[PDB]
């Protein structure tokens with residue numbers, strides 16, 4: 242990772258929090274191409290000091306996203322490690338997270354918008370699958386909107402996938418359980434079971450989110466009831482906008498080997 246000086250980072254407004262993290266908008270002072278000085282908007286992700294013993298997995302998650310270059314993956318700019326502070330410096334994405342956007346605009350996002358975003362997510366996941374790279378935390382909170390639909394020029398929305406955060410292979414079991422039904426049943430059974438098939442299941446859950454106006458599936462269930470939902474081999478209810486319900490259920494197959502390839506998923510989306 243490129244090291245960024247603490248003195249070159251300005252922290253501004255809080256945008257939210259993740260698992261053991263706090264997230265801020267900020268500014269990076271840098272020398273750009275041609276030696277020109279710039280002050281650039283950036284996303285600053287800060288690992289909680291109390292959880293600094295997770296720093297390796299915190300940074301490894303961003304490393305994954307920088308292994309490859311792709312138009313649908315958020316860019317990492319560098320890191321700042323100062324004292325007990327572990328900071329990831331990333332691309333600031335203008336319109337924020339997809340789950341909040343879907344809720345704010347639930348009454349003016351139509352099925353073609355949802356389909357285009359699903360296709361873009363599937364394109365990203367196909368790229369990762371071809372590179373045998375596991376993401377491990379596909380969810381609408383980890384999708385960011387670079388630009389909105391422009392109905393007048395026929396320009397679609399454009400999304401990027403963000404880094405997965407600290408891996409479910411090291412997180413406390415209670416956090417994995419709270420993340421049902423994004424975490425697949427085999428990973429609840431054994432977090433070592435994390436596999437490319439993991440991301441097909443989570444992709445299904447994320448499609449459910451995309452079709453549900455920012456509702457969170459099973460949010461009314463406490464953790465014990467979420468665990469029992471998997472024990473009973475239940476499926477999520479069809480979204481009211483049900484056009485992708487079959488694909489959701491095909492991806493959320495309790496048998497990992499039966500989940501479709503992302504090539505097959507894209508074929509299904511393109512046939513709609």
Ligand SMILES: c1nc2c(NC3CCCCC3)nc(Nc3ccc(N4CCOCC4)cc3)nc2[nH]1
Nearest residue numbers: 256257258264284331332333334335336337338
């Ligand atoms: C990598 N990770 C990113 C973000 N993650 C946030 C993490 C906390 C919840 C909101 C998204 N936000 C980013 N930008 C935001 C842009 C607008 C935002 N909102 C717009 C709608 O009104 C609320 C703020 C929020 C975050 N960019 C980014 N790159």
